[PDB]
Design a binder for this molecule. Structure first.
Ligand SMILES: Nc1ccn(-c2cc(O)c(COP(=O)(O)O)o2)c(=O)n1
Ligand SMILES: Nc1ccn(-c2cc(O)c(COP(=O)(O)O)o2)c(=O)n1
Lengths: 433, 428
């Protein structure tokens, strides 16, 4: 009944990954994803490969398609490199075995082949093979960290904590993520401190409130409205940190504009890193990743001063633009859901930010297809919400849909949108009564 | 100053070329202090401009290495950036039609900045600037990074100046860079005793020092004794003004030929604050084949810096043991010796005085040579670059600078030695 026993089973695999890296002297290709979790894993792998005297070539892909894998296969012909896949690989393992890659797969997504040792050439470190839920108990950067600690590089756990936040696995903190955080505390690489979300930004509080999207508070979402609210309740809006009296006064007033004020409180992680707040670094890597600035994201993980300066500039441009995108949403209410039409890459992010009491579905039309992205919260699921079954009703409209209880998608022909949404609305009202 | 405006034409074009490239990028540097510093300048510059890259560190840019690299142009043609190499191999790079940028301070084969619309070559000799005295390969990389405003990278340029022994005297473009790093507050200069850079006990700092090498003090015990006799606590780690005066007078008296005990220290903005120490640290890890660790030291990683300190002192001890057992053999106008792969260059440098020194080691069926001279020797017509080139007469290859060059041959060590002593008689 111990995390210790499960680690001993995982450590058989990480030992083999370690020996495999040390004894390789050819080229090394690292392939990672572009979100916070992937850029974190990239930085963990980068530091770890350098410390073990391994030069490497890092590439970032949004999706590991058949085309990308075949394009990669054309590098095996001349100098067959060792490939390390982070946050990807397990679902595409068939195509990786087909081309006979020399490969290490570090993936928390559900696996296709539940084996750690695939043949003589491919090692797969996936927590699902050990009975650990990769959607709640570990992230991709956690998986790389498990490898990194085989070399005793505990200082890299701070990048794992970043990925834990990036993937929204910090509340509640479960399984291996809890083990990682506690190890980082034991080795003095993180300090944990309950605090208000607005103090993570180290800027003027009225700007931290104005552009916050976790939670998004519409009535406070502008410098002017935020300044006014802070002046009225006796707080200097130019301060960059709220003390204990400030936070009481703030929370006391704000509960009228935004009643679920437990969302305003977090456990802050202060990390051994130039960007000392892990929540801020998580948001920075996200913004940088969304703007295509992958290499700058790696530099941030590597603590370079000018990448950090870029990242700080891109973060605030990104946060301002997101608030504007949010103010422009035409939110339509049905009986048990909200819905809106938005842009292709935003509807998922925006729907999640807009949830409060009811689920939110955003959709965009492309050609004659409408693609939907639906979001809830833990309070809704506990009242019997399940989005995967409600998005599955798309098959009745000549489409299909599924996902998780709290997040799901679906596709439908452009002209059945109104009738799909009315059907989804009724299913959800069923799931609540 | 006037020459910067002429160089700035090529640096601008290099900038636009890198910016507008969106495929793969290959960076090829050398393993000495200068090439590793170049690796660090290009690594940070490329990240800051949003370029992923594949860095490789090679010991010789041979015909064979070039041919292996060119098979990467068949599928997805990368932009190649060559640092501290490529100018003498320019003929083979054109042959294979690399999309390339050559950042090299070795004497050029072709004397053009813009080769064939596909190659840019930034060589200081093109502009009448001496790649042996006035600029290093780091400084060439720094001249590009300037174009982006990455002035903080000047500290790695200073590390290359020291590593390529161009700090005393400080000339030309190196002087521009140093002053630029001082104006932007990235370096502080302070005159001090050489032994104060190591931040270890003084008797160890003396025992293992090789600039200057003092054979009678090159031992923990003899150094411990020498300091106790003259009234200095040998367990101290920094010498104050009074101990500096007492150590100087004692060393200079017993060894009046000695020099370079007082140096201008460069305190850089870097986790390894002393650039002289950083220069030695990078040299040590390079000679041990720890290329990625050297990059990591430039990128200021704590664990890499930890390795570099351990390796550095292992290296300085082995070096002292090698110097006490060297079999210097005189020919007509050179000395020569056999040694270990990672020492023959540095030992040649330390021993050189009155005549050029060539060291070599055997690896497989090949012998690799390393020839060194002084500025005093180069002023009298010494040119190791031409003299080592004679290795093509023995089915080989050789080149470098006037003052420091290398070569490879097979079973013709004594013969090619003689043929080079011949070329160095004529030169003198
Ligand atoms: N037929 C489908 C379509 C989508 N999904 C899915 C997975 C996932 O994580 C989400 C939520 O994210 P998105 O769909 O991108 O809003 O949806 C599914 O399971 N079955
Ligand atoms: N065919 C060659 C071999 C060596 N070099 C070279 C560059 C450099 O800085 C030194 C110093 O000498 P070594 O440390 O012996 O390589 O040599 C060259 O340019 N062409």
């Amino acid at each position: 009944a111990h995390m210790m026993e499960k680690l001993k089973e995982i450590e058989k695999v990480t030992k083999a990954i370690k020996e495999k890296i040390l004894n390789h002297y050819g080229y090394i290709r690292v392939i990672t994803h572009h979100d916070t979790d992937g850029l974190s894993s990239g930085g963990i792998l980068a530091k770890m490969l350098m410390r073990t005297n391994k030069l490497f070539h890092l590439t970032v892909v949004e999706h590991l398609s058949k085309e990308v894998i075949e394009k990669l296969a054309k590098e095996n012909e001349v100098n067959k490199p060792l490939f390390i896949f982070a946050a990807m690989g397990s679902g595409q393992i068939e195509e990786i075995i087909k081309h006979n890659f020399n490969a290490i797969i570090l993936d928390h997504h559900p696996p296709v082949i539940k084996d750690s040792f695939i043949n003589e050439n491919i090692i797969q470190l996936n927590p699902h093979i050990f009975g650990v839920d990769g959607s709640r108990e570990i992230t991709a950067s956690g998986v790389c960290y498990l490898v990194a600690r085989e070399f005793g590089y505990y200082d890299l756990s701070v990048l794992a904590i970043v990925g834990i936040i990036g993937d929204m696995q910090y509340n509640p903190l479960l399984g291996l993520n809890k083990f990682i955080v506690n190890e980082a505390r034991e080795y003095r690489y993180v300090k944990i401190m309950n605090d208000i979300v607005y103090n993570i930004y180290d800027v003027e509080i009225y700007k931290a409130i104005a552009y916050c999207t976790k939670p998004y508070i519409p009535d406070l979402a502008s410098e002017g409205k935020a300044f006014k609210f802070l002046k009225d309740i006796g707080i200097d809006p130019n301060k960059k940190q709220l003390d204990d009296t400030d936070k009481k006064k703030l929370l006391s007033a704000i509960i009228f504009k935004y009643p679920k004020i437990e969302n305003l409180l977090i456990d802050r992680y202060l990390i051994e890193h130039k960007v000392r707040d892990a929540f801020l670094l998580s948001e920075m890597l996200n913004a940088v990743g969304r703007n295509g600035l992958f290499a700058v994201g790696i530099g941030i993980c590597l603590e370079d001063d000018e990448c950090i300066k870029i990242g700080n500039q891109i973060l605030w441009e990104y946060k301002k633009n997101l608030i504007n995108e949010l103010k422009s949403v035409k939110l339509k209410k049905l009986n048990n859901i909200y819905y809106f039409e938005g842009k292709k890459g935003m509807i998922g992010i925006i729907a999640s930010i807009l949830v409060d009491d009811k689920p939110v579905i955003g959709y965009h039309i492309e050609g004659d297809i409408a693609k939907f992205s639906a979001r809830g919260n833990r309070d809704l699921v506990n009242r019997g919400l399940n989005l995967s079954v409600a998005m599955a009703v798309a098959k009745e409209f000549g489409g299909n849909g599924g996902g998780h209880d709290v997040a799901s998608g679906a596709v439908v022909s452009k002209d059945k949108v109104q009738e799909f949404l009315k059907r989804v609305d009724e299913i959800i009202g069923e799931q609540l009564r």
